[PDB]
Amino acid sequence: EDVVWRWSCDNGKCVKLKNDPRSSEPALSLEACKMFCNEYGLLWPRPTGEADLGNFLSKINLNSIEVKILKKGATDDLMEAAAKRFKEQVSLAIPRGSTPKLTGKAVDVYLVNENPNEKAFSLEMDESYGLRVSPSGADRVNATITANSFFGMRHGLETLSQLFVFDDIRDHLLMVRDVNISDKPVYPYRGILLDTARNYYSIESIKRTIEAMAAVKLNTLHWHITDSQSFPFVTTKRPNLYKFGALSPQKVYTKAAIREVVRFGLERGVRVLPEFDAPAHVGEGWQDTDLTVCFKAEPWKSYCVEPPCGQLNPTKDELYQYLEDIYSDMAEVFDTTDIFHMGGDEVSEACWNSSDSIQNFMMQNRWDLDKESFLKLWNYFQQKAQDKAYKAFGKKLPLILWTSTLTNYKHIDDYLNKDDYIIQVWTTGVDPQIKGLLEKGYRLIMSNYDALYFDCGYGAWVGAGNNWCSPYIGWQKVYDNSPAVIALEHRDQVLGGEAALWSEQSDTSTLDGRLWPRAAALAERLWAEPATSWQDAEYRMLHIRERFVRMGIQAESLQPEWCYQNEGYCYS
């Protein structure tokens, strides 16, 4: 049938009223009411500069949307793809099974990229843009996006596509008539860590993730591609690793597939940042190489944080020839990344100390068999690994390592330095380590486990009960988590944050629900850094969830749809 209700703004809330036929007032559809009742309308994330949306809408012909690229250059392929992608984005305003009337004005999208040759990712890349929308004569609209690079430009296309609403009362596609927007992100690094080694994730599900990331302007996919449980990364120079390491022959990431993903990400302003976690978090794949110790060691609680146990043996020269080859194979297909993640997850002294060859190496070099000695072995490893990474990427590039014993601020400067190493932080924001690190000039990527671990809250995968970092982190807690509050003065040293999806209990099937719409909360926090909290973003978060679902993302449900149609009535 046809929609029977209407909506009217009242103290910032769209109230549902009956659409009585005996009225001279034009009825508002739910989202038409929302676009103007809300401070920032249906925008996610909300802009950092000007947010002038005006007061009116305009009927639009869907078939009469034409995009024109004004400045041409090296990024022609990228801009043409992003423009072709724009028409499809506009259709996301329309609910499936509803068709818009083919009438209304024509839309002219004018893309001006003022440095059409820049297409490299860097922490200094300019992702700012300007958005102007105004009527053009009688039967058309002037939509102009102006930005310093392609990245800001496609960010602007994203924001522009959010200015379309569907009127399901009349079946009209509408657009905001007069907009003036200036925008740019607060943090340069906005990411998701996807663990694809504890469980496999189809290429299609990964592209689908990147698609959703772009929709809320997140720019980094950190691809945790290897661990102790599997080695799906197809390494040509050391094919024995993925042949023995993969969960199955089909559960693998080939050079062609990775290139597809990397290119797909580039077209969408997403840096695909590969990680090889070492010298811990290794196992499957390294059988019969004699380059690991403690693999499947029992009882596992004595040797590692989670089974199977396994670490690299740094005392063997051949290890670094394997490492160089792995890095080189990564550098070849991950060819948009400006950064490389080397893991640095906590090493087990117990494991290294159980090895004959390792103990002899430490005695014959005078070191002892104490915690400080094994910290030297780790430094010894990381220094040589680092050297090979540089040779592999054919240049020096920033490296990322987790907060660990090795990166304790008290002694991190012994072999690490703040110009070469970025530190990813899992510890809670009130930990002394963050302050100690910030003061020694180190840059941070925030991934604090109490706000940013998207795996928390489920059943136990060893034993019974729940998983280690329960309870489940609602989007509210991730939205409110602010690096600016954590960093304080040293906040420019914070590069941004990363939602971490560890995959002991997540794979292809649970991917959508794990990330969305929670990652959108991180998206707004890192793009805008609001002084306002989650309550002020609630209505817009509900809408962005619906947009994800319309995109085909199987996003988590936050609230009854009733709350979305009846703002103000669901509260606590």
Rounded-to-integer distance, Cα 225 and Cα 322, Å: 16
Determine which residue in the list 256, 363, 369, 485 makes contact with ligand NAG, applying CB under 6 A. 369
Looking at the Cβ atoms of 70 and 102, the one nearer to ligand NAG is 70
Q: At what angle do helices 538-550 and 203-215 cross, to 10 degrees?
A: 140
Asked whether the beta carbons of 292 and 311 are under 8 A apart, the reply is yes
The number of C-alpha atoms within 13 Å of 66 and in the hemisphere containing its C-beta is 8
Stretch that binds ligand NAG, among 56-64, 85-93, 164-172, 366-374 (CB under 6 A): 366-374
The site partner of 142 among ligand NF1, ligand NAG, none (C-beta below 5 to 8 Å per kind) is ligand NAG
Catalytic annotation, pick one of 227, 512, 524, 567? 227
Give me 444's structure tokens: 């941070």
Looking at the Cβ atoms of 221 and 375, the one nearer to ligand NAG is 375
Tell me the DSSP string of 251-271. S-B-HHHHHHHHHHHHTTT-E
Catalytic annotation, pick one of 222, 281, 341, 543? 281
Q: Which residues contact 11 (CB under 8 A, 6 or more apart)?
A: 568
The site partner of 164 among ligand NAG, ligand NF1, none (C-beta below 5 to 8 Å per kind) is none
Looking at the Cβ atoms of 304 and 339, the one nearer to ligand NAG is 304
281 given a catalytic annotation: yes
Determine which residue in the list 31, 158, 345, 349 makes contact with ligand NAG, applying CB under 6 A. 349
The answer to whether the peptide bond before residue 185 is cis (omega within 30 degrees of 0) is no
Rounded-to-integer distance, Cα 520 and Cα 218, Å: 8
Q: Which residues contact 234 (CB under 8 A, 6 or more apart)?
A: 242, 252, 253, 254, 255, 258, 329
Asked whether the beta carbons of 456 and 472 are under 8 A apart, the reply is yes
- Which residues on adjacent β-strands are paired with residue 129? 183
Does 303 participate in binding ligand NF1 (rule CB under 6 A)? no
Looking at the Cβ atoms of 156 and 274, the one nearer to ligand NF1 is 274
Looking at the Cβ atoms of 133 and 445, the one nearer to ligand NAG is 133
Does 345 participate in binding ligand NF1 (rule CB under 6 A)? yes
Rounded-to-integer distance, Cα 496 and Cα 225, Å: 22
Catalytic annotation, pick one of 346, 431, 504, 556? 346
Looking at the Cβ atoms of 84 and 301, the one nearer to ligand NF1 is 301
Does 305 participate in binding ligand NF1 (rule CB under 6 A)? yes
Closest CA to 125 of 50, 184, 75, 182: 184
Looking at the Cβ atoms of 72 and 371, the one nearer to ligand NAG is 371
Give the binding-site size for ligand NF1 (rule: CB under 6 A): 7
Does 380 participate in binding ligand NF1 (rule CB under 6 A)? no
Contact pattern from residue 515 through residue 554 relative to ligand NF1, giving x for each residue in contact according to CB under 6 A and a dash for the rest:
----------------------------------------
**Dihedral angle sign, alpha carbons of residues 244, 247, 251, 254:** negative
* Type of residue found at 515: L
Give me 212's structure tokens: 């959703």
Q: How many CB atoms lie within 10 A of CB 81?
A: 17
Quote the least distance from Cβ 313 to ligand NAG, whole Å. 15
CA 435 from centroid of its chain's CA atoms: 25
338 given a catalytic annotation: no
Place of tokens 């220094």: 383
Residues 99-138 that bind ligand NAG (CB under 6 A): 110, 132, 136
Quote the least distance from Cβ 463 to ligand NF1, whole Å. 7
Quote the least distance from Cβ 496 to ligand NF1, whole Å. 17
227 given a catalytic annotation: yes
Stretch that binds ligand NAG, among 169-177, 363-371, 440-448, 544-552 (CB under 6 A): 363-371
Stretch that binds ligand NAG, among 82-90, 303-311, 365-373, 387-395 (CB under 6 A): 365-373
Does 355 participate in binding ligand NAG (rule CB under 6 A)? no
Asked whether the beta carbons of 195 and 147 are under 8 A apart, the reply is no
Looking at the Cβ atoms of 320 and 468, the one nearer to ligand NF1 is 468
Asked whether the beta carbons of 295 and 308 are under 8 A apart, the reply is yes
Place of tokens 């994800």: 548
Contact pattern from residue 204 through residue 233 relative to ligand NAG, giving x for each residue in contact according to CB under 6 A and a dash for the rest:
------------------------------
Asked whether the beta carbons of 517 and 474 are under 8 A apart, the reply is no
Q: How many CB atoms lie within 10 A of CB 374?
A: 22
Contact pattern from residue 162 through residue 191 relative to ligand NAG, giving x for each residue in contact according to CB under 6 A and a dash for the rest:
------------------------------
Residues 165-194 that bind ligand NF1 (CB under 6 A): none
| H or E element in which residue 498 lies | strand 494-501
Rounded-to-integer distance, Cα 572 and Cα 556, Å: 21
The site partner of 512 among ligand NAG, ligand NF1, none (C-beta below 5 to 8 Å per kind) is none
Place of tokens 């085909």: 552
Quote the least distance from Cβ 373 to ligand NAG, whole Å. 7
CA 234 from centroid of its chain's CA atoms: 23
Quote the least distance from Cβ 191 to ligand NF1, whole Å. 14
Give me 476's structure tokens: 């509210």
Looking at the Cβ atoms of 91 and 427, the one nearer to ligand NF1 is 427
Does 426 participate in binding ligand NF1 (rule CB under 6 A)? yes
Does 349 participate in binding ligand NF1 (rule CB under 6 A)? no
Report the chain's C-alpha Rg in angstroms: 26
Task: Tell me which residues touch ligand NAG (CB under 6 A).
Answer: 110, 132, 136, 142, 144, 349, 353, 369-371
Site of interaction with ligand NF1 (CB under 6 A)? 305-306, 345, 402, 426, 462, 468
Return the active site residues.
227, 281, 346
